[PDB]
Amino acid sequence: SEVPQVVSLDPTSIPIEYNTPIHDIKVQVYDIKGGCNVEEGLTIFLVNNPGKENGPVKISSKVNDKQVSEFLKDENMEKFNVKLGTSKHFYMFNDNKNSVAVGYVGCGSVADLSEADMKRVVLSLVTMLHDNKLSKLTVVFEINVDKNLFRFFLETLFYEYMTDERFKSEYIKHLGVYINNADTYKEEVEKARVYYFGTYYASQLIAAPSNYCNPVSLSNAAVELAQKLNLEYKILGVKELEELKMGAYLSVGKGSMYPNKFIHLTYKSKGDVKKKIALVGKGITFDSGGYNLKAAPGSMIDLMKFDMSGCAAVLGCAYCVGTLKPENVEIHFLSAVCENMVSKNSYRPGDIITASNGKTIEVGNTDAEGRLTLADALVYAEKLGVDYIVDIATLTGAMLYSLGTSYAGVFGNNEELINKILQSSKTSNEPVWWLPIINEYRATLNSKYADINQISSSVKASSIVASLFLKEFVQNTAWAHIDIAGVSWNFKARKPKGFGVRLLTEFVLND
Amino acid sequence: ASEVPQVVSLDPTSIPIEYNTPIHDIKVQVYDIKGGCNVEEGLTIFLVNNPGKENGPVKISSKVNDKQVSEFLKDENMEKFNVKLGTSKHFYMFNDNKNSVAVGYVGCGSVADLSEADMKRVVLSLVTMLHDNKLSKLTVVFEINVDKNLFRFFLETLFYEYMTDERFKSTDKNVNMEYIKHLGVYINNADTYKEEVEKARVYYFGTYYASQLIAAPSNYCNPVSLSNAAVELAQKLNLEYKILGVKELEELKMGAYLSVGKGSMYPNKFIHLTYKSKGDVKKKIALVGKGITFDSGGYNLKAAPGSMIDLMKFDMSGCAAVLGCAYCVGTLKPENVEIHFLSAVCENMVSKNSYRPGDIITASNGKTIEVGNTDAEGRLTLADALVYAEKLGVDYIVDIATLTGAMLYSLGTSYAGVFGNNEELINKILQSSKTSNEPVWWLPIINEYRATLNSKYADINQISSSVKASSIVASLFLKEFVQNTAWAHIDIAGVSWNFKARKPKGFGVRLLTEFVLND
Amino acid sequence: SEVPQVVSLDPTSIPIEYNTPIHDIKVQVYDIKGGCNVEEGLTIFLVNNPGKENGPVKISSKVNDKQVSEFLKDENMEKFNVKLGTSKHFYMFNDNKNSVAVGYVGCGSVADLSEADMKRVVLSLVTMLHDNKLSKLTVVFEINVDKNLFRFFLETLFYEYMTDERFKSTDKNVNMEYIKHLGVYINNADTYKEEVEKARVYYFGTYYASQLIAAPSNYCNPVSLSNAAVELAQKLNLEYKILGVKELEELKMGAYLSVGKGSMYPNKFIHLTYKSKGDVKKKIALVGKGITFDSGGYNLKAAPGSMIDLMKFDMSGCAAVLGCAYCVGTLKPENVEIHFLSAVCENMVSKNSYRPGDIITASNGKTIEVGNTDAEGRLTLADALVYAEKLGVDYIVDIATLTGAMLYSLGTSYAGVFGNNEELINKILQSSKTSNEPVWWLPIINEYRATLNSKYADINQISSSVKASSIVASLFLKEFVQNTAWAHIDIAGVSWNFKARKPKGFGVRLLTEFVLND
Amino acid sequence: VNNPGKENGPVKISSKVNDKQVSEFLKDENMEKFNVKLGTSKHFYMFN
């Protein structure tokens, strides 16, 4: 498990932060009926105006401080508006002559916030936290959210508040929440904190550049994670991968100085097993394209450290599952990890390679490497004899032109499973849309020489074609495929989303 | 009608349209298989499968009312052939009356319920047997299971694919072109299937009519000639009609639609056809089709590799499907409905008179629009068509358009995408997709992208600056022009043209008609 | 007739120079065995040294002056070599105590100079004429050349020497002075004497063509070019007619008319005729592609390498045909009837332009599906070929800047010839030899014909699958000649001299030699 | 089989065939229903 180096200055591990300052925040949830106390730090009102305009801010909650309550009177507050994400905050002295900050974030005019909207709310709030030295934040909900959305608020807050400074060379210690029917929201708090970290852990792996995060260091990190969670683990090396005849997966890695590593973590519930699941993540630690090099305008080769986002989501999910400890489920966490590089040793456009199920594949484009690695992972996953196989992958850039940057696409061979994923999208608030596997396009994968083509020459619906290819490697097991090529990276914030950790955990939990 | 302007005298002044096609001379007779099959003149084709047995052997199960033919078609003789989807074989023999007969089969594979795609492969194989063989009659024996809709779909597709469009042929007409006069069909429970026959013939012609308008090049089919054809159609069907000209469009302040047509030598013409049932009207529907008779891109000229400027006569496919639907509706005469058939027809050209990238134009609902790309012209014309539609006071607005090339990257060439603001209406569309066998998939209008249409100067941007999901952004733009009516949008940019066969599909005619009929 | 203008500063004619300085040159040929007189101006010896690479200059001619003869002794000349294209200037006094200038141009080792080699020699000589104000040049041939190559020397010398200042205003060359006399010393001079005025005629045909080509598309548009052609016909007493739009409509030339639809200039079809006074034994139609500017139309020339700034040259074929009309009309061959044809128009972007996808109808009734508006040349030629065949001629030869693909097949030196008749093709190759305008036979590959099959129209203008566009274009044109020997000369690669930044006037001499020899 | 002169003309088989059933299949009246366009084919199964 020694990471090879070219020079002594090359890093030999991924730095990982486990103990984050988010974990130090004491959280308290209070009912809003008893009035709000404003004694310290920053207090923010989440305010809308239905009908409205953008109408005026009007505060409805009772505040147990004379000076603040004066500040918050309708005549002052109408000077401001509830346009989504708009905020104002002011420092003042309270009834005990102590310095208090008080303000609001506008939640617009609709009464049901979408995940997108709520995200805009949190971002405004985070901007104030990053701009202010505070011991404590207090948030009071003057809008209605359900339990899942409340938890989404917390996760998004923690995640966005946290700043990754691992490669560079003050946080609040308390969070108060005022909300109607407080007691029903309390269970969401620590769940949010677990969901935050699984997501942030995924992010750290994705953000970690390819010199740091390579097939050896990523599998080392996965082992260290399993050890900390008491998960069973197994890392398959080149020799075993050859014995298993994983020729599609091995071919992708031929050109890399980093030997292929296959990750297999296993969680088992205490109880009687009622569902066995294999979660398979695409783990290309750097996708240069291979001989089909990413040289075309817009191919974004500098982003391609993110091509192990699927693997990160699966690993982050492992954190959440290993921590929350759901019952009656056995989960396998799989990733065929490798690096797609240019070398005398690389596989070539046109090569015919042989998958572990015996299928010969003609490589039409070395930059369609993910589906080759996934083919062998899927064969491996099916041999585990599980009930559901779900794979998640940054597989096709075409997703940007279908669903874009907000919704991932799910494709599958089984409507019941697909529907379970859509439900988990609803409760996780990571949005997914069901796209079809159109069988009429299957003929385009008929190779003249091999059993099957890797790519289509004629069909531009590449996300569907890739799904048709993948489907050839699952024979008799319910399977779904989540393409996160569009959603994984947050282009505007210049960072990963850690997309899919919460989706997969909800999937596991809801079962 | 209006006079079509010409640059030279040899410029065509109308679209050639074939109404009385050879398919309409075909006499169809349907028999129940339980009565046995008579095997006489022409070509008798058995549709045969073998469930579960992939590439399984052919077995003819139907009673054949001829001793020679029954002997020929017995299991031992047929076992050398297999049912592989699309395969076919011709047989020759003498019957009990000493007349030579031609017989054969088309293989329908080993899966019992044929998809719409599978059935098309079967039909294409059948058509291959009709081509280059001068036959007076074809007889088809169904030894596979099909529901009523799939039976109709077989007939529609057969009629459509058999037909050959020679309107623009002159020196190269097919000397050997000769159609059957009779079509016999044997099927179990024949009486239940009979009602589908004329329905299929009507659906075939609506689709083929749309196909004719689309395949017609932009010199033949321009906004004046296309609106003229809509008038002629309306007169033949006794639909009400109104064609709005520029002066009337100006009065209605349709600035977004008018701006697109500024650079064309052909004046904008807005088609408005109306069917009204004689009964008491229970539902009112507007069907809106994109009617760009040629899309050069305008100043944002289609010059990039893969922009397929030579295909762009097809950018009135949406208008064509709405008109094809008008044919079907006006022919079948549904009760209790009032249907408006709408198209803002124009041509997107490069000229001293063209609108420019950056121009700010005002739609008929007062919204100002910043033009970011003159090649996103469809959504601008649809904006004003949607405002016009909503003022009619209908229950549903459905538009259909070759709107975004991105469709090819999302759903590809077989499935159209539907988007909308109302779930009930979307499900009705999806239901019509099932019964018409023209596949459509529901795609989301993702509100998070809406902010990317915020203009610094105008009320709204025509295009997104940052979002590449253009089919979704376009849908977001269109939604701004429907205020309080259930509305759905069908993007057929990917499915309209059959690239393999080098012809249009007339996609959407049957879909839209089923939608009207089922309601 | 009247050229339309957008503003009053728009030109309404092509400026044309007919009486050139070359025409003022008095040429005298003398037999070299009488010895050479060296009395004034510049006297240049053309010398080689067969079989000795970069061999020494040796002057073998007798020079009728003691002082000059001494100067050019082998001893004095041995320091110089005959490397092809090298040259030297000498200065001395002759017997008359007069200042005299002498030099040489090396013609290498091979005793048989190629077309390319001879142009190298002529270019070196012109370098000696430029930037030196001389009243007289004398050339002494100490190399062997046949009659066609001697004529080629003069034609090339005249053409290269001539500088086109029609569009110069504030930047004319103040030092521009042309010799008034040219003396030529050659062995067996009597046989070469008849080549001189032939060379002058050939030079002007070529120069005339180049003037038309070089003239930009604002000056040279379909009206002004057809106007020029009438003027030329009047000067030569050729019969002429220009067919205008209404006549073109009556003749149903729908392919040709569609290309011009987008232009502010009306289509003009040029038809000049030369007819011998004797019995007519051969009738010939010469067809020249005449696109005065090719923007590409809606298939706009926007791709890198499309060279839109060069497209004033897309009437190079018409220009070659008109230059041939000048030569034929001047030299007056017997036994022949020649029709000089061009369907002239401009390919532009407009509300009025034809579109990609349009189906149009040619004058022979064939419907054509336009796959690319930038393949306009073959549409205009289609109707011109139909017109040509209706004249009842023995041969139709077209010449056109038809396909950029020529750059990748033959390049900038050799034109391609395609045809439906081996005898006609061979006559063109033979004319290539005697005109020294190089041409190579390329095949019309019938296997590609199916790629022109259209789903809706009788035929496709362009291929869907085949990249060999010069072949595809020829297949298309062939569909418009029914039963007449026809050949097609694609000059897209050779028409413009990219290094010298000017047209060659390619094809005038080739076409004239074809007519003359037949 | 070809048909000189007649573009896409009918198929006519000239060879004598030593089978009565096949001889009858190959008669002009049957074959004229097909054409000689380059690459076009038809074949039929029968008993001899």
Ligand SMILES: N[C@@H](c1ccc(-n2cccn2)cc1)P(=O)(O)O
């Ligand atoms: N790694 C896949 C991928 C993922 C995302 C993008 N991409 C995301 C945004 C723009 N391009 C491109 C390729 P692949 O190269 O299709 O294997």
Ligand SMILES: N[C@@H](c1ccc(-n2cccn2)cc1)P(=O)(O)O
């Ligand atoms: N006419 C629309 C369109 C439709 C289809 C295609 N297209 C269909 C297939 C490939 N490209 C491109 C543009 P538009 O240019 O987006 O308005």
Ligand SMILES: N[C@@H](c1ccc(-n2cccn2)cc1)P(=O)(O)O
């Ligand atoms: N005018 C023809 C042409 C001729 C020459 C070149 N060309 C010559 C050199 C580089 N490009 C390009 C187009 P066309 O655009 O094929 O009609």
Ligand SMILES: [Zn+2]
């Ligand atoms: Zn790749």
Ligand SMILES: [Zn+2]
């Ligand atoms: Zn990848």
Ligand SMILES: [Zn+2]
């Ligand atoms: Zn467009």
Ligand SMILES: [Zn+2]
């Ligand atoms: Zn369009």
Ligand SMILES: [Zn+2]
């Ligand atoms: Zn061109």
Ligand SMILES: [Zn+2]
């Ligand atoms: Zn040209």
